[PDB]
């Protein structure tokens, strides 16, 4: 091996390692910045600025073990560490070199939460946490509990009581709310939140709009939403059901307000609570749908972008180690009061991918479009649908459906590496390079990606 | 005692409750049942104290769901008003087709997908006691400690 | 008056729906 400088670097090596305190690694800014966490100490290296890596020991507040999962906001600016009981959100000290100051050391412990904070009674455990994609300065996190309750905490505001959507029902049997959620996932418009429930074998529901305290919205996207909103309005007639008409109007209003209160400088906008509370839309219609899958259940769901114009492809796991690629063919309308709204909740099964192995968890690295990493059993395969999704992408803006004639919709399924423990991943662009950091427990592999 | 709302009935019915009504207004019949025709039925076994209870604001039965006591407003103690144990029977409960939202009523596909357990795990998670599921009428029955 | 972008958006939207029919028939 040319062993020039890969895998070997200041920030990546550290002995005196305990066979416990797991380690994590995250990229940021197109594989520029790096965040490494080991022995309860955070390391960050900016492969543009910084000449050497700087660190921070947070062992004083958190003692990482194996109940924790850590995730970093896309912007990279933040980190969230949680378990089925508590949440810790820390602000990576970019630009900071010395972080020794025992007082400034705490000016990074931005948010804390523990289920044992609710009065008394049965307190259900945390099932997953997410950073809200468009939550201006990553100020909002979404916590899903066992009671399928989805809660949004405004990390940077004590004066902000959390919002709790899809609350429990005093009824019995099936009602309105979405029961038995197995996985959460945001749309690439960052306004819709997809949910994968099990109750009926597995269907898809969604929260449109799922908003944060303050929305992160650039001008390109402000318009896009705004336009789609008008096209919707323009399309209303007489056949349009009342409830739908109602929403669409309410939608154009809300969005027409986003436009007024838009902050041109920063690129944010304040979203008043009303609009924030919303009832679940769903179930979506998957079509066509393989008769087999009715026996099995859904495992996970992920969203893979295929360009930049938010044109995405939904992805669902299944028991038979099957994967399906759906395409949202109809423009949704926002909803709020409506119990069991379904107006235009439709998906189209593009392709199916059988793997037969056990599908542990789906993962995607933003930076590389049309690519999905499926953590099989002891494998990690990279399903690449850029074969046809790049064509599907043109046919969309060209309003040309001919190129899709006799085109074969097969994902070039490759194989990354082998692992036992469900790995961690990251995209590093080292010297114009596609690097895939694979962090198993002890392991810490590095590879390349086709393109 | 009042029972307006379309479809709602009782066993003994409202007529059979005009007879067994105590000479003071103390109507207390045993093995009482109620429900909206076609949707469901809630069976309170043993003795019950229906002593002038407005059924119009107590019981509600929508497809696949049931409500006892609007909330917990006047929700009597556990074993008082109607907040007692019972056996609910919600009907017309079927899974829906993923391609056309159609009702799967075929005892086969119903058994192939096992609507059984799926509906059971929903009773479990609801603090209720699963009983059974009759495909033919889409009947789902479970027992609850209270309401 | 006249529309410029918004029009394009509708085309896009419509097209996605057009694509919808593609896959609905392309299978069975």
């Amino acid at each position: 091996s040319q062993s020039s400088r890969l895998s070997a670097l200041p920030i990546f090596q550290a002995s005196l390692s305990a066979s416990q305190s797991p380690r994590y690694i995250f990229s940021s800014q197109n594989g520029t910045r790096i965040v490494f966490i080991q022995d309860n100490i955070i390391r960050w290296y900016n492969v543009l600025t910084d000449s050497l890596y700087h660190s921070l020991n947070f062992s004083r507040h958190l003692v990482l073990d194996d109940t924790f999962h850590v995730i970093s906001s896309t912007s990279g600016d933040l980190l969230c560490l949680f378990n089925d009981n508590e949440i810790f959100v820390m602000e990576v000290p970019w630009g900071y070199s010395n972080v020794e100051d025992v007082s400034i050391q705490d000016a990074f412990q931005i948010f804390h939460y523990s289920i044992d904070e609710e009065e008394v009674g049965p307190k259900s455990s945390i099932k997953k946490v997410l950073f809200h994609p468009k939550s201006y300065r990553d100020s909002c996190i979404v916590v899903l509990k066992e009671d399928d309750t989805i809660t949004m905490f405004d990390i940077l505001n004590s004066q902000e009581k959390p919002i709790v959507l899809n609350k429990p029902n005093n009824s019995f049997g099936l009602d309105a709310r979405v029961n038995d959620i197995t996985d959460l996932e945001f749309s690439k418009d960052g306004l819709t939140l997809y949910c994968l429930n099990t109750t009926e074998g597995g269907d898809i529901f969604a929260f449109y709009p799922f908003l944060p305290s303050v929305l992160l919205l650039n001008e390109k996207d402000l318009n896009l939403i705004l336009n789609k909103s008008l096209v919707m309005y323009e399309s209303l007639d007489s056949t349009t059901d009342v409830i739908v008409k109602r929403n669409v109007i309410k939608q154009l209003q809300f969005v027409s307000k986003l436009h007024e209160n838009w902050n041109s400088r920063f690129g944010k906008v304040d979203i008043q609570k009303e609009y924030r509370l919303a009832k679940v839309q769903g179930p979506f219609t998957i079509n066509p749908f393989p008769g087999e899958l009715y026996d099995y259940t859904a495992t996970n769901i992920a969203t893979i972008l295929i360009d930049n114009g938010q044109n995405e492809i939904v992805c669902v796991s299944f028991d038979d180690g099957s994967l399906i690629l759906l395409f949202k063919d109809l423009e949704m309308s926002m909803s709020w009061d409506v119990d069991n709204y379904v107006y235009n909740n439709s998906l189209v099964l593009i392709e199916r991918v059988k793997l037969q192995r056990e599908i542990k968890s789906l993962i995607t690295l933003p930076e590389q479009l049309g690519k999905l990493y499926v953590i099989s059993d002891n494998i990690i395969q990279q399903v690449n649908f850029m074969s046809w999704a790049s064509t599907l992408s043109k046919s969309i803006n060209e309003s040309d459906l001919n190129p899709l004639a006799g085109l074969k919709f097969e994902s070039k399924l490759e194989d990354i590496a082998t692992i036992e423990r469900i790995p961690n991943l990251a995209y590093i662009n080292w010297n114009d390079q596609s690097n895939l950091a694979l962090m198993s427990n002890k392991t810490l592999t590095f590879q390349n990606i086709s393109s | 005692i009042v029972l307006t709302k379309v479809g709602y009935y009782t066993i003994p019915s409202m007529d059979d409750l005009a007879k067994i009504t105590n000479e003071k207004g103390e109507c207390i019949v045993s093995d009482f049942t109620i429900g909206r025709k076609g949707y469901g039925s809630i069976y309170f076994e043993g003795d019950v104290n229906l002593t002038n209870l407005n059924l119009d604001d107590i019981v509600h039965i929508r497809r696949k769901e049931v409500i006892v006591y609007v909330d917990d407003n006047q929700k009597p103690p556990v074993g008082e008003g109607l907040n007692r144990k019972a056996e609910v029977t919600l009907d017309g409960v079927w899974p829906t087709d993923k391609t056309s939202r159609c009702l799967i009523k075929s005892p086969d596909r119903l058994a192939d997908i096992n609507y059984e357990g799926r509906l059971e795990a929903v009773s479990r998670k609801q603090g209720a006691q699963f009983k059974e599921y009759r495909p033919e009428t889409g009947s789902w029955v479970f027992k609850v400690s209270h309401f | 008056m006249k529309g410029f972008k918004v029009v394009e958006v509708g085309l896009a939207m419509n097209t996605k729906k057009q694509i919808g029919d593609f896959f609905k028939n392309l299978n069975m």
Side-chain angles (χ1 to χ4, degrees):
Chain A
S1 49
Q2 177 207 50
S3 288
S4 76
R5 14 163 54 107
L6 233 338
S7 69
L9 221 76
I11 182 176
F12 284 121
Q13 291 137 222
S15 63
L16 199 291
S17 56
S19 64
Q20 45 230 51
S21 53
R23 306 174 300 154
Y24 305 92
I25 178 182
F26 310 119
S27 77
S28 188
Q29 308 206 319
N30 189 59
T32 297
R33 302 153 64 181
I34 302 179
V35 177
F36 191 69
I37 308 175
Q38 183 188 320
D39 280 294
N40 294 274
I41 293 180
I42 294 183
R43 303 187 180 179
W44 61 92
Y45 182 60
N46 195 309
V47 194
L48 294 181
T49 300
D50 309 315
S51 62
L52 191 275
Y53 90 77
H54 309 300
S55 313
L56 180 51
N57 179 299
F58 62 76
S59 304
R60 194 214 318 189
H61 307 88
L62 197 62
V63 182
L64 292 184
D65 49 59
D66 286 308
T67 333
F68 286 52
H69 300 64
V70 301
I71 59 178
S72 184
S73 75
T74 48
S75 50
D77 299 292
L78 291 177
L79 274 163
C80 175
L81 318 86
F82 58 88
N83 74 305
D84 56 304
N85 180 294
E86 57 206 304
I87 307 173
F88 286 83
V89 183
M90 293 149 207
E91 177 174 64
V92 186
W94 299 88
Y96 289 59
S97 40
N98 179 71
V99 190
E100 190 184 305
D101 205 312
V102 184
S103 75
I104 304 177
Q105 217 182 304
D106 293 48
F108 288 117
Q109 296 308 313
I110 292 184
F111 184 74
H112 173 66
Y113 176 80
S114 179
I115 60 177
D116 296 303
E117 185 45 34
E118 262 71 65
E119 276 184 297
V120 191
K123 302 177 194 180
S124 199
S125 46
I126 297 180
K127 194 169 187 172
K128 187 178 184 189
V129 175
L130 298 177
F131 259 109
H132 187 295
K134 290 202 172 176
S135 56
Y136 187 70
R137 282 208 269 75
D138 324 273
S139 46
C140 250
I141 23 180
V142 198
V143 186
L144 174 58
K145 291 192 171 181
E146 290 309 324
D147 52 311
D148 299 306
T149 286
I150 308 168
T151 308
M152 288 188 292
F153 291 101
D154 178 310
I155 297 174
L156 333 202
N157 219 300
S158 328
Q159 305 171 300
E160 289 296 69
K161 298 184 175 185
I163 302 170
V164 188
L165 311 187
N166 199 51
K167 292 191 181 192
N169 225 350
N170 215 1
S171 301
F172 266 99
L174 316 185
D175 48 286
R177 49 164 278 159
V178 180
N179 286 290
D180 312 325
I181 301 182
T182 303
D183 199 32
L184 251 61
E185 186 72 28
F186 268 72
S187 197
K188 289 304 165 284
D189 56 39
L191 299 175
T192 306
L193 167 61
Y194 292 125
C195 302
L196 186 34
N197 97 324
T198 288
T199 319
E200 245 193 54
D203 303 280
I204 304 164
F205 289 76
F207 285 89
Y208 186 52
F210 194 73
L211 307 167
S213 48
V214 190
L215 179 82
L216 216 193
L217 191 64
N218 61 48
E219 186 181 70
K220 179 190 181 186
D221 294 281
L222 165 66
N223 293 335
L224 170 102
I225 181 62
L226 177 38
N227 295 302
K228 299 164 58 184
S229 298
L230 299 176
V231 179
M232 283 279 88
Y233 189 80
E234 262 202 306
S235 170
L236 292 170
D237 59 276
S238 312
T239 301
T240 310
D241 155 289
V242 223
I243 305 162
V244 175
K245 203 184 168 202
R246 161 101 173 312
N247 287 339
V248 204
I249 312 293
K250 256 222 74 188
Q251 170 189 288
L252 175 51
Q253 298 187 290
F254 163 61
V255 185
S256 235
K257 248 181 156 196
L258 273 190
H259 187 75
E260 298 164 49
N261 295 43
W262 187 55
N263 195 304
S264 54
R265 292 213 78 199
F266 305 43
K268 58 173 183 183
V269 63
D270 295 307
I271 292 176
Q272 328 173 306
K273 46 187 171 193
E274 297 57 55
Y275 307 119
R276 283 244 253 164
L277 295 163
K279 288 192 177 179
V280 210
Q281 267 179 78
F284 272 71
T285 308
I286 302 176
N287 185 78
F289 190 68
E292 309 178 305
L293 306 175
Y294 272 106
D295 298 303
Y296 308 61
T297 308
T299 316
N300 319 61
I301 192 174
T303 289
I304 306 79
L305 184 49
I306 75 180
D307 48 31
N308 45 79
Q310 317 184 321
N311 264 298
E312 52 170 47
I313 293 181
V314 166
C315 196
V316 182
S317 301
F318 268 112
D319 285 323
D320 72 312
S322 200
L323 197 62
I324 53 171
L325 306 176
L326 319 175
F327 175 53
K328 183 171 162 288
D329 68 326
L330 312 172
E331 189 59 60
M332 288 180 83
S333 71
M334 279 157 71
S335 166
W336 279 284
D337 320 282
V338 196
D339 289 284
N340 297 292
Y341 194 48
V342 169
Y343 179 66
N344 271 262
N345 292 352
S346 183
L347 295 163
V348 180
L349 174 68
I350 291 181
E351 114 165 63
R352 180 179 191 178
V353 164
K354 286 195 158 199
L355 293 170
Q356 297 159 293
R357 322 150 166 301
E358 171 187 294
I359 305 190
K360 248 123 82 174
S361 59
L362 309 175
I363 305 178
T364 67
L365 310 186
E367 301 57 60
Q368 297 199 317
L369 305 170
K371 305 188 176 187
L372 171 75
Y373 292 124
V374 186
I375 284 182
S376 307
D377 203 312
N378 36 297
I379 308 191
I380 298 178
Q381 298 168 291
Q382 167 184 282
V383 250
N384 183 68
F385 25 66
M386 277 308 292
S387 313
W388 49 271
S390 53
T391 294
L392 180 59
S393 187
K394 268 196 173 181
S395 60
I396 284 191
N397 314 57
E398 288 189 62
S399 296
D400 196 320
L401 262 54
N402 291 295
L404 306 183
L407 204 188
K408 306 297 179 178
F409 298 104
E410 270 185 294
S411 296
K412 294 183 181 180
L413 182 61
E414 222 182 72
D415 303 282
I416 294 302
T418 291
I419 38 64
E420 354 74 77
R421 332 279 285 182
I422 305 170
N424 173 307
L425 294 74
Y427 175 84
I428 304 184
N429 186 291
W430 214 60
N431 304 316
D432 295 290
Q433 286 288 20
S434 50
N435 293 333
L436 168 61
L438 258 181
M439 173 94 62
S440 207
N441 212 331
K442 345 79 176 187
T443 296
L444 181 37
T445 310
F446 285 65
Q447 314 183 322
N448 267 286
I449 310 300
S450 44
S451 182
Chain B
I1 295 180
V2 181
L3 190 60
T4 309
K5 298 183 178 183
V6 301
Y8 285 119
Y9 65 53
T10 43
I11 290 178
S13 61
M14 288 288 269
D15 307 305
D16 202 301
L17 294 174
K19 292 186 186 298
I20 50 71
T21 181
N22 200 292
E23 289 78 9
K24 207 83 173 185
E26 298 136 359
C27 184
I28 296 179
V29 65
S30 64
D31 294 299
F32 172 68
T33 301
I34 181 178
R36 203 203 303 197
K37 288 195 172 183
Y39 295 175
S41 59
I42 307 174
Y43 175 59
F44 288 114
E45 175 184 293
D47 304 1
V48 192
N49 185 296
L50 299 65
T51 304
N52 289 70
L53 286 178
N54 188 57
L55 294 176
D56 279 62
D57 299 7
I58 299 179
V59 56
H60 308 306
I61 303 179
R62 274 83 73 71
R63 193 71 62 182
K64 298 188 174 188
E65 181 196 62
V66 63
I67 307 173
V68 175
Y69 281 148
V70 187
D71 41 299
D72 57 2
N73 189 303
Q74 297 188 303
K75 190 175 171 181
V78 192
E80 273 283 337
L82 198 51
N83 202 116
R84 52 160 306 178
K85 72 287 278 60
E87 181 193 69
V88 182
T89 305
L90 298 184
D91 307 302
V93 179
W94 284 287
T96 60
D97 192 301
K98 287 171 182 46
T99 79
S100 47
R101 22 242 330 180
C102 281
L103 297 183
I104 283 62
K105 311 171 66 182
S106 160
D108 313 35
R109 300 237 304 181
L110 237 40
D112 302 4
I113 76 161
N114 166 70
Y115 196 72
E116 278 282 356
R118 291 279 174 50
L119 213 54
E120 170 177 61
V122 182
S123 292
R124 175 178 307 151
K125 299 180 179 176
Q126 274 192 94
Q129 190 178 61
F130 181 74
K131 239 57 187 63
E132 58 171 60
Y133 174 68
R134 302 191 291 283
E136 298 72 4
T137 46
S139 297
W140 165 29
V141 290
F142 49 50
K143 291 183 178 301
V144 304
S145 51
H146 65 130
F147 275 126
Chain C
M1 299 176 272
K2 42 76 199 308
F4 38 57
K5 256 295 183 176
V6 72
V7 180
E8 179 177 287
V9 188
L11 231 193
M13 266 169 64
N14 179 72
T15 304
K16 293 176 200 155
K17 175 178 188 173
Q18 229 177 314
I19 291 185
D21 303 322
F22 183 18
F23 297 134
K24 298 178 192 284
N25 306 306
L26 167 63
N27 294 174
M28 287 282 73

